[PDB]
Amino acid sequence: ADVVMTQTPSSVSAAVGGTVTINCQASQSISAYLAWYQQKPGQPPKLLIYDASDLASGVSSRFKGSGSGTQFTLTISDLECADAATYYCQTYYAIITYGAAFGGGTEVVVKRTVAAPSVFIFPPSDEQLKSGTASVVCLLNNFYPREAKVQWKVDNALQSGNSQESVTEQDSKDCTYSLSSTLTLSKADYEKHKVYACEVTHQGLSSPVTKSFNRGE
Amino acid sequence: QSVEESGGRLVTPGTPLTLTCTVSGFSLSDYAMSWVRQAPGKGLEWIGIIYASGSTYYASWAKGRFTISKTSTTVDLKITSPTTEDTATYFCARYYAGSDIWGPGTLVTVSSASTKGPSVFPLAPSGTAALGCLVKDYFPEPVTVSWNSGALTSGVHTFPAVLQSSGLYSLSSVVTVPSSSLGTQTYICNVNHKPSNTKVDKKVEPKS
């Protein structure tokens, strides 16, 4: 049967300058025929380590592979924001018999000091209103840590069920996230209310920040 | 040495689809090649390999569901009878000691829904200002966004697409800029949805 690579943990974290450890366990012995890869968002994987411990050309010696047989480790030292990515192991022992499965992946989260978001609200465009729908967007820009609470109110009534959040991955220079919350209403419903408000709660904000507009003003 | 995948597109379930891996700067008579895929948000999945001498080997779940073949300079992956398990980005990769050379990937979408190009709406700016473009209601993925034809990159955030309950995708792209530049600089988002042949340039400015 195909070799299975059990990769743990699913996520691991340390501060800038710190070290993380990522593990893989092969279902039977694969000797030293193990590779490690980095995959940044939107990109193909990049080979870091082959034959369990040998560095691919150009790769920083901050990346260290160890192990043999059934247990392997990737250790990333002097962690940088640019290391925020998903890492994968892969067997290539006797592929013709056992296949070349990847482990399930491990995310690396790079910790830093608290950074409050800047908050912005955007009303729907007049052009969009011709579609019969209105999108209202609240932007939280460049914050850390990830946890953030976005509250929508329309004429002071709490909203739910009509919004969707999207979040970026950690920035490669400053380790922050950005987030959009998009409230979608019909044009007809949008035109029945005046005050549109996004209130943000975040560890870096001493009290919540509200951005709002009045329809038509 | 490099490779590049092509052929990823929207197909209806059950329609065979062939992807192509074009290689350059090395010979397929010297190296094996694998195909790997990755469903949105998920992990890498090794599909199979074709050795220099032509023998093919597949993951246990791939046997009978994919065919790998090659010419002198390309490797193909045929997906015999696509399902939604097959919606994914597919990569080809050269094998040496591990997989060292990878392509950018090609995206396959398996669905009965129709292609639809996006509408692009301004996120108009209200000492740092934010502005953006809302790219709404498109299918299938992907969309790309640049600002000022690539001249503006600092402070840009293009959010991952969301799939709306309508079955259509949406995303926004935003940028922060000096508030004093709103009066004097021009900010244009360049939106490309190749599946629908849509390319839109939208100037984003304060609402009068």
Author numbering:
A (entry chain L): 1 to 217
B (entry chain H): 1 to 126, 133 to 214
Article sentences:
Nevertheless, X-ray crystallography of Fab14 and hBSGΔ–Fab14 revealed the structure of the extracellular region of the hBSGΔ–Fab14 complex at a high resolution of 2.51 Å.
Xkr8–Basigin is a plasma membrane phospholipid scramblase activated by kinases or caspases. Xkr8 is responsible for exposing PtdSer in apoptotic cells, and its deficiency causes systemic lupus erythematosus–type autoimmune disease and male infertility. Xkr8 requires BSG or NPTN to localize to the plasma membrane. BSG carries two immunoglobulin domains, one of which is dispensable for its chaperone-like activity.
